[PDB]
Design a protein around this ligand. Sequence first.
Ligand SMILES: Cc1cccc(C(=O)NCC(=O)O)c1
Length: 165
Amino acid sequence: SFSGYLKLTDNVYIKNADIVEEAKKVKPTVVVNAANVYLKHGGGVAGALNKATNNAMQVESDDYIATNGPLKVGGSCVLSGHNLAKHCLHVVGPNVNKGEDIQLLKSAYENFNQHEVLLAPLLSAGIFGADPIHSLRVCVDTVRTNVYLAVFDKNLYDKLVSSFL
Ligand SMILES: Cc1cccc(C(=O)NCC(=O)O)c1
């Protein structure tokens, strides 16, 4: 199971780790992907998770979009976790770099409440442009299920822990 996590609250845990490496080690029931509405897994967490599946996540995602159309910003879909997890919960946080409403970050985190335990990144953080400190705050105040957050960047991880209220 999950190891080396710092407990932030009753249900939120955090670790400085590569979420792909964490997923391959733990093989969690759910790994969260930092998805976009098109499920185009190009960069950041999505690109890394997809590359770890040898592009199987993208092929499956393209079939999902062909059938269902794009997701909503703040929405999610459950697809296969491939070699990383039982399932992948593709969650679309607002992309501040595309001018999307940061208020949708709480709706995006609400998707985590449908799963008892998840391995996840900070939504809308990184290349999505939102403040990761704010993302962690929204996570703690929204997610009630057990969430194990993997923060890739060491300097950000240190700042997140040291500033956590
Ligand atoms: C280097 C940098 C700048 C701004 C934001 C971030 C960030 O939220 N990263 C997420 C993560 O490392 O898991 C990193």
